Structure 1
Amino acid sequence: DYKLTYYTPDYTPKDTDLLAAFRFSPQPGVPADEAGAAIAAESSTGTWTLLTDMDRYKGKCYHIEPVQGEENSYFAFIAYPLDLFEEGSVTNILTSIVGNVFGFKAIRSLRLEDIRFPVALVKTFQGPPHGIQVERDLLNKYGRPMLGCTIKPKLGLSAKNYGRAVYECLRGGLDFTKDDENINSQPFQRWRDRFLFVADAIHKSQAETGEIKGHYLNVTAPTCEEMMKRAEFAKELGMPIIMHDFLTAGFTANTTLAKWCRDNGVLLHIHRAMHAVIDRQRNHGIHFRVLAKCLRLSGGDHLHSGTVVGKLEGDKASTLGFVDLMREDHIEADRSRGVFFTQDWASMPGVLPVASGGIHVWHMPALVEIFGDDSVLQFGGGTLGHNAPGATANRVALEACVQARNEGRDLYREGGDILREAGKWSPELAAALDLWKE
């Protein structure tokens, strides 16, 4: 029995408690209150744990409600005391919250929809190495989303061919290029060679345009010291931003890399590889809200937030939810956007959302309207065009959409119209204007 002490409905949280919102489907035969109390007891001191007042450490299931629309499915809000978590350790927060409960037998399925970090805990973490304002200042790109080119003809490329591809795509006018998430250092292309040649390309680009251009050099490595080798060498070459896969590599390695980046002034682009393994099924896993929050705490300036270019259910709203759970300082609780708790970030900076892709410039106005101009749009299409032409197309189209947005004009009814209006100053943009013709 757990409800006797772990279910306190008349309890109110403190401003120094960690609040966790679970969505759980219980096994046929157990009531929602018993299962919620059990979730509370398993993510903290369990039953039979005694001689001390082991009550200031117990989690407490302070709320249980039935979710509207689904049968045998509930939300459970649980409150953990602040003195259970190691300061500055995302790994400990996780292995305390989600370390044990998901394999509870008396529950058919469990999902962690949101989690509220107290300010008394947000303060301990370093946070994003730079944030949004700082990284805009470092790159000197104001009032416009940043543009990204993914070099997708990726594996069969020699290091020098990779370098020329990066150089030409950046010469067209993008701001960043991106190493694919699964290219660290492999027989066909070792890491140090790619670093050398993309650094040469970046310097050639900055020399001929005058703008600060970069490349998310992937430093995800088998060990932390090898990762540090790669990061140190990337800095030695003068690279302004590196890349990391926080879920595959881990949170220990990512926290280490973030602390190193803060101390060395390189922006840390985060790629959410392996994420769908734990957030796709609405009945089990960990919602990407929790992972975006855990990242903002651990460290990272950019974060892949996916895209909304047709997956537009109430689900799309959920995206918006977390996309300002990591850009704002205060977020009000409104379950219509999936934000279960109000989160105060204590002036910790925000991370930049990265648009999944769609090199197709027909939702670019839609993306400028959704993610705003404080975001990165990563056209993961290899810069098709017909290269430098596709790059110029993307850049000119972005500048057109943002100039139209600044003029009080709509970009959901006037999207194709403004794109066609812009396509008449350059043939490259004309070669790719709307939902077709790529």
Structure 2
Amino acid sequence: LTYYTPEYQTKDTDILAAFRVTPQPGVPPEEAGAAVAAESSTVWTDGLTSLDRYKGRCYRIERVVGEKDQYIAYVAYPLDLFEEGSVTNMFTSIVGNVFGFKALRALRLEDLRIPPAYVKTFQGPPHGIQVERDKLNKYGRPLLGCTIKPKLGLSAKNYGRAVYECLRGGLDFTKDDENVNSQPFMRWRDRFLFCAEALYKAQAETGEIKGHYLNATAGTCEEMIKRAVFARELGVPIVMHDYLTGGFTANTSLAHYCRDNGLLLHIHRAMHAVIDRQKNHGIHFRVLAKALRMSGGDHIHSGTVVGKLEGERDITLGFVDLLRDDFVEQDRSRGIYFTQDWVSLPGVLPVASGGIHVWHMPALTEIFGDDSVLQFGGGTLGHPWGNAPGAVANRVALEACVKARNEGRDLAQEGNEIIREACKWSPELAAACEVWKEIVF
């Protein structure tokens, strides 16, 4: 029929969407899939224009063999619907009205294939993995990050004390909490100044380049760039933004500013699980990750694999590759519903956060490999002798998981032994995993 066209041969300049759709109670997949296509595109005096040129086409139905009424509908959208360079208009045209369509029960967006003629209208990362490594002079080992805690509550001079301590211990980055913006207890400019002081102190001391993600998220576009501008002014290497509460419009502005002024952008996925957790309605995270590679950021929060089953671990590695790689082939196993050519857009380095502890080091060094930031909150901090030796703790742990990998040892097996023999020459690392000795050894 008009919007269900199994006939269809997809154009290379077409945006394809794989939507998991669950119809009502007496609505055939064929109508569901075609309503999805009708509603993320058009309707009337198409004798004054042409319906057919601008119509979204449902060109495939699969049945998700497992669930109830779940199907995977494949919709194809004309490149002429899309405003070049606006992720805001990609999402408004695809996910803007279909998820509330009464004839479906739930609808989830699983993947988008973004054609090379639209990828080239976007800047993408202001710098990306290769440049960032270059700029920072950090090669052959995952980069280590550290969370400053508590989330809210702390003062600017205090935050900076925390930051210096953690950075001189061996981490390369420390992080403004996703929601320290500017509040009664720590206004931004004071924070930025005291942390620029702690981070240069740490760097002068260690000899390695340091950075602190200064969070420039703000309630207006103007206040956000104002913060970015003063980080530029202290000569500090990275600012951070909460892209999903901030918004896509604003983050494309902060990403252009970082490109133009030399600052790395670290992104935090705050609010994603309001959007991506339920498995039957929403937008899958690899589609939110793809929209950040295109909107622009150099680092993004990928989650953790700590305590994840091998089936989960594979969808995670599907979208980590979508973030770092130029070509990713369709591999429905790890949820890669479409092959994606990135036509050289730079890759986003992934950040593994929350629950990570020293003894998880060999698994994360093997599951993520060198191009990632491994982020310890409670690791750095939770160490009992304090956070500079908790930083040493975390830094020798990792440089032993790397040495070992280079010597051919297997991190999946020898993990617990690797870390065990490195505890022998680091009281820091020893102290760091004393309870884990008790359960394990």
- Alignment TM-score, normalising by the size of structure 1: 0.97
- Judging changes above 3 Å, is the alpha-carbon distance between structure 1 residues 52 and 73 closer, same or farther for their aligned structure 2 residues? same
2:4 to 2, 7, 10: 7
Tell me, yes or no, if the aligned pair for 2:181 and 2:188 is still in contact at 8 Å: yes
- Please give the secondary structure, in 1, of the residue aligned with 2:436: coil
Query: How much has 1:39 moved relative to structure 2?
Result: 0.3
- Judging changes above 3 Å, is the alpha-carbon distance between structure 1 residues 396 and 25 closer, same or farther for their aligned structure 2 residues? same
- 2:260 is the counterpart of 1:255: no
Whole-angstrom distance in 1 between the partners of 2:402 and 2:415: 11
- Show the 5 A alignment for 1:135-214: 135-214=132-211
- 2:377 is the counterpart of 1:384: no
Query: How much has 1:358 moved relative to structure 2?
Result: 2.5
Q: Which residue of 1 aligns with 2:36?
A: 39
- 2:291 is the counterpart of 1:278: no
Identity over aligned pairs, percent = 79
2:368 to 350, 366, 371: 371
- Please give the secondary structure, in 2, of the residue aligned with 1:8: coil
Amino acid at match of 2:48: L
Q: Which residue of 1 aligns with 2:397?
A: 397
Query: How much has 1:304 moved relative to structure 2?
Result: 0.1
Query: How much has 1:366 moved relative to structure 2?
Result: 0.4
Whole-angstrom distance in 2 between the partners of 1:70 and 1:435: 43
Tell me, yes or no, if the aligned pair for 1:41 and 1:47 is still in contact at 8 Å: no
Whole-angstrom distance in 2 between the partners of 1:49 and 1:109: 30
Amino acid at match of 1:86: E
- Judging changes above 3 Å, is the alpha-carbon distance between structure 1 residues 49 and 367 closer, same or farther for their aligned structure 2 residues? farther
Tell me, yes or no, if the aligned pair for 1:329 and 1:344 is still in contact at 8 Å: yes
Moved over 6 A (4+): none
Task: Report the count of equivalent residues.
Answer: 435
Q: Which residue of 2 aligns with 1:63?
A: 60
- 2:423 is the counterpart of 1:423: yes
Query: How much has 1:154 moved relative to structure 2?
Result: 3.9
Query: How much has 1:389 moved relative to structure 2?
Result: 1.1
Query: How much has 1:155 moved relative to structure 2?
Result: 2.7
Tell me, yes or no, if the aligned pair for 2:151 and 2:179 is still in contact at 8 Å: no
- Show the 5 A alignment for 1:20-419: 20-46=17-43, 50-381=47-378, 383-386=381-384, 387-419=387-419
Query: How much has 1:326 moved relative to structure 2?
Result: 0.9
Whole-angstrom distance in 1 between the partners of 2:302 and 2:328: 18
Query: Per-residue CA shift, 1:339-376, capped at 9, x if unaligned?
Result: 00000000111001000233411211100111111000
Query: Per-residue CA shift, 1:234-274, capped at 9, x if unaligned?
Result: 11111100100000010000000000000001000000000
Amino acid at match of 2:374: L
- Judging changes above 3 Å, is the alpha-carbon distance between structure 1 residues 98 and 176 closer, same or farther for their aligned structure 2 residues? same
- Judging changes above 3 Å, is the alpha-carbon distance between structure 1 residues 29 and 154 closer, same or farther for their aligned structure 2 residues? closer
- Judging changes above 3 Å, is the alpha-carbon distance between structure 1 residues 61 and 419 closer, same or farther for their aligned structure 2 residues? same
Amino acid at match of 1:130: H
- Please give the secondary structure, in 2, of the residue aligned with 1:363: helix
Amino acid at match of 1:288: F
- Judging changes above 3 Å, is the alpha-carbon distance between structure 1 residues 429 and 292 closer, same or farther for their aligned structure 2 residues? same
Query: How much has 1:224 moved relative to structure 2?
Result: 0.7
Q: Which residue of 2 aligns with 1:433?
A: 433
Structure that is richer in helix per residue = 2
Q: For structure 1, which segment, 149-158 or 94-103, has the greater mean C-alpha deviation from structure 2 after superposition? A: 149-158
Amino acid at match of 2:136: L
When the two chains are superposed, the root-mean-square deviation of aligned CA atoms in Å is: 1.3
Tell me, yes or no, if the aligned pair for 1:362 and 1:434 is still in contact at 8 Å: no
Query: How much has 1:424 moved relative to structure 2?
Result: 1.1
Query: Per-residue CA shift, 1:153-202, capped at 9, x if unaligned?
Result: 34332211111110011111110000111110110111111001000001
Whole-angstrom distance in 2 between the partners of 1:263 and 1:68: 49
Query: Per-residue CA shift, 1:21-77, capped at 9, x if unaligned?
Result: 000100001000011001000000136774322211101011101001111110000
Tell me, yes or no, if the aligned pair for 1:216 and 1:242 is still in contact at 8 Å: yes
- Please give the secondary structure, in 2, of the residue aligned with 1:7: coil
Query: How much has 1:128 moved relative to structure 2?
Result: 0.3
Tell me, yes or no, if the aligned pair for 2:19 and 2:110 is still in contact at 8 Å: yes
Query: How much has 1:316 moved relative to structure 2?
Result: 2.0
Tell me, yes or no, if the aligned pair for 1:331 and 1:342 is still in contact at 8 Å: yes
Whole-angstrom distance in 2 between the partners of 1:229 and 1:163: 21
Tell me, yes or no, if the aligned pair for 1:362 and 1:435 is still in contact at 8 Å: no
